[PDB]
Structure formats: structure tokens, C-alpha cells
Curated annotation (Swiss-Prot), chain B:
Highest taxon in the source lineage: Eukaryota
InterPro entries: ConA-like_dom_sf, Lectin_LegA_CS, Lectin_legB_Mn/Ca_BS, Legume_lectin_dom, Leguminous_Lectin
UniProt-annotated binding residues for Ca(2+): 10, 12, 14, 19, 206
Subunit structure: Homotetramer.
SUPFAM superfamilies, alphabetized: Concanavalin A-like lectins/glucanases
Protein name, as recorded: Concanavalin-A
Provenance organism: Canavalia lineata (Beach bean)
A Pfam cross-reference name: Lectin_legB
Length: 237, 235
């Protein structure tokens, strides 16, 4: 079982897995059962924006999803992610479909991590921005059904050439470089990710969702990780 | 009068008011009496760094002071600045000395604020690693001058290199900061300065603070020594 820290955009209410009875954002530490959730008025076929932020001083991971009509949901959780994450990690995006299905299209993705040790404004830092994904995107490690098509969009799960999503699909995009999320003597580690998405469905019950995740370097899509496990977890412990 | 939010590097234990009995860092919302505080053993004459951090989603203002030897102190407060702060305000540095005195030298000051919404994102980043005699993007107040040594001297220093007593100075960024907004999914900022606090006297005073306030903030009077150039009295 890989280590996973994630912010999950859960579109399908699995009440078997302990998911509230509505779509929701959640914060997941090493389990699909969120540590904290908030109700999320998913808007069909609209372009949504997610922001994940964490600084290691206040030790609070936060997320906010928002749609252009003004509506948004926030969730936040307290943890020393240094306790739970390895020094070095990859970061990425995950999505999945089940019997219910939905476009898991990523239009934009950006990330910044910064390690500020004990000195004069000299920081280890990494910052990347993707607003156009391209067929051959050599700095993404695509896994599963994820393709970065020619439309400038990351499709984390399968889609027909006719705009209909495929069920039973799992996909993920990881930055190629490992990220220095922490190190022993590190007074401030902090990161933040934004991504824009289009989750659209002809279904009543689009499913399932998209997630920003951090896991160890040679993280692969774990088996039995589709639909409700959003490509992150092998099972639902 | 002019609302304030500060992170104070308070070097002098003023129990006549509300400090703790050791030098310290604290988060001040409208009052010198820190809403939270942490023990901070400032290292005389050693160059240190301070990082203020805040995002409008988690509602937690955080701050950490560290020196090169590894040592650092941290303090956080849950607070929704959007509720305490005008949409538009200036940010700055402030410092003061009293009977006891020390250098309040700023070597570097940087600042980022970002206001997002539904890639509609307004932002303001600035960085000073060298201050110059003619810093037209700083509004200097009180005894603050931008020395010839490339540093910002918030309180008065001698031509010799020693500190004045009973001094109070502050540097504010010229441009007003849009610190939050109506359709603001995220309104976050973060600020580090590096500083050199030096005394020969056995107990230095009084401290340095990063602060946020309305656009027309001026030093309220007599806030020297224990009030760190920020609040009029000790309420
Ligand atoms: C929504 C999001 C963009 C994540 O806002 C975060 O607070 N990042 C801001 C700065 C924007 C970042 O994209 O540069 C402050 Se958080 C902190 C900034 C320095 C790097 C670590 C994260
Ligand atoms: C403490 C805090 C305010 C968070 O420091 C940030 O890293 N701003 C620095 C400013 C560096 C300046 O050169 O811009 C990093 Se932001 C900047 C963005 C891309 C180029 C280098 C770093
Ligand atoms: Ca679910
Ligand atoms: Ca004091
Ligand atoms: Mn869920
Ligand atoms: Mn104090």
C-alpha cells in the first residue's frame, strides 16, 4: 500500500465507503475515508477550479473547489505532513469512473513546493504550470488511462472521440521529477496546487471524481483501485 | 482608528502589560497583547529570518523565526483576516526601542499576496534584498531610514554603529495591497524579512514586527518601546 495524501473531488456518494450522502471535497490521509469532508454542489459540464494549500508552520492542509458562477466548497485538516510523507515524493492527479461515468478532463495544473531552511531568503523550490498539455508531455508520467490529448487537455480517464466518457476507467498524471516536500532541518516546507477541471455528464449520477495526490516516488496505480477508490487506494480501509 | 494585524518579534518581557516573562513571538489582532505567543530566544547579533504565512481557506495566520544554528520558534492563530481587515491596506515593518535598545536592521524584505476567484488571479509580489538611500517604493515613518550599508534601519543607529534609545520607525510598501475581495476563493499572503538585532546591554528591547493596516496608517503617538510602533496604548 503506497503512502497517499490526497484532496479528493468525490462526485459519487459511496455510502458503503463512509462517504457523506452527497458529492464532496475531502482530505484523505492514507485512506479513502476522508479525515474531513465538505458538501460540494457539483455543477455539470462547467469548468471548476481546485486549489490545495499547505504550509508546515500552521500544519493545516486546506482545499477549495469553486465554479465560475461563484459557488465553492472548502475543507481543511490539521497535520504535520512531514510525519506522514517521505522526504521525497511525486505529486499528481488522479481520476476514475465506474458504472457511472464523467469527463475527468484537466485543463490546467500548477504546483509549487518550497523548502526554506535556516537562512536569508534562499529557498529550495519547485514550480510548474501546465495550461496546455501536449501529446508528448515528457515531464508527466502518465499512468493507466490518462492521455494528454491534442486538445490541450489532460484526460485522466478514457473518453470517446465523441465527447462521451468511459466507465470502468482509472488514470493519473504525475510530475516527472520527485519533489522535495521536506528534509530534516526544514523550518518551512510548503506547497500549493491549483487545477482546473471539466466534469460533465449525461448521467444523473456522474462518477466518481478527481484527486490531487502526493505519494512516494515510484507510486503506481495500486490494483483494485478504480471507481470509488479514485486510483489512489487498493481497498477502502 | 487604524486597525492592525501584526507578527511581533518581541525581545523584551513587558509584564506591566500582558507579555510572557521571556522574549517572544506573537500574533497581534488589534492589540499589543498577543492573541497567541511562543517562547523565542532571540540570539544577540546574529542574522535571523521571519516568515509570515496566511491563506484565507484555512484561516490560520502562522509565523516562524529562525536563526542559522537550527533554532526557531513558531506561533499560529486561527483568524479570518477578511473579517478584521479592510479590502485594501498597506503592509509594512515596524520597530522600536526604549530604555533598553537594540539595532532593528532589516537586511531583506519580501512579500506576496494573491487574490483568486473563479486563471483570474490578481497578485502583488515584491522583494527587497538591498535598500537604497532613495527607496521611492517605501513610505518611511518615524526614525526609519534606508542605510548606505544596503540595509533598512527601522530605529536610529549611530554613525558609529550603536543603537539609539527611545526610537520608533516603520517601512510600508508604497502600493496599497488588495489583501482580499468579494469573489475571492483564495486571498493569501506570505512575508519573510531577515533582521539583525544586536545589543551590548544585557537585555535588549523592544522588537520588530511585520504588520498589516489600512492604507493611511501612521505611527499612532507614544507607541515607542513596548508598543513597537503599532498600537496607541496597551489595550
Ligand atoms: C491556491 C494557491 C495558488 C495554492 O494559493 C496558495 O496559497 N499558494 C500561494 C502562492 C501561489 C503559488 O501558486 O505560488 C501561497 Se502558498 C505557498 C506559496 C509559496 C510556495 C509554497 C506554497
Ligand atoms: C516568503 C515568501 C514571500 C513566500 O517568499 C517567496 O518565495 N517569494 C519569493 C520571491 C522571489 C522573487 O525573485 O520573486 C519566491 Se517567488 C519568485 C517567483 C518565481 C521566480 C523566483 C521566485
Ligand atoms: Ca466516492
Ligand atoms: Ca514586549
Ligand atoms: Mn469521498
Ligand atoms: Mn509581546
Amino acid at each position: 500500500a503506497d503512502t497517499i495524501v490526497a484532496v479528493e473531488l468525490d462526485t459519487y456518494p459511496n455510502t458503503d465507503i463512509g462517504d457523506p450522502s452527497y458529492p464532496h471535497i475531502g482530505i484523505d490521509i492514507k485512506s479513502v475515508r476522508s479525515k474531513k469532508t465538505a458538501k460540494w454542489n457539483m455543477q455539470n459540464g462547467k469548468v471548476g477550479t481546485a486549489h490545495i494549500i499547505y504550509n508546515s508552520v500552521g500544519k493545516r492542509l486546506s482545499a477549495v473547489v469553486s465554479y465560475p458562477n461563484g459557488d465553492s466548497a472548502t475543507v481543511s485538516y490539521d497535520v504535520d505532513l512531514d510525519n506522514v510523507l517521505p522526504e521525497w515524493v511525486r505529486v499528481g492527479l488522479s481520476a476514475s469512473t465506474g458504472l457511472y461515468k464523467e469527463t475527468n478532463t484537466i485543463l490546467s495544473w500548477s504546483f509549487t513546493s518550497k523548502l526554506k531552511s535556516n537562512s536569508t531568503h534562499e529557498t529550495n523550490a519547485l514550480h510548474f504550470v501546465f495550461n496546455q498539455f501536449s501529446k508528448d508531455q515528457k515531464d508527466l508520467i502518465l499512468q493507466g488511462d490518462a492521455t494528454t490529448g491534442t486538445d490541450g487537455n489532460l484526460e485522466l480517464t478514457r473518453v470517446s472521440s465523441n465527447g462521451s466518457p468511459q466507465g470502468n476507467s482509472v488514470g493519473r498524471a504525475l510530475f516527472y521529477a520527485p519533489v522535495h516536500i521536506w528534509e530534516s532541518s526544514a523550518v518551512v516546507a510548503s506547497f500549493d496546487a491549483t487545477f482546473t477541471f471539466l466534469i460533465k455528464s449525461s448521467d444523473s449520477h456522474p462518477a466518481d471524481g478527481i484527486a490531487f495526490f502526493i505519494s512516494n516516488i515510484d507510486s503506481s496505480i495500486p490494483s483494485g483501485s478504480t471507481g470509488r477508490l479514485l486510483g489512489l487506494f487498493p481497498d477502502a480501509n
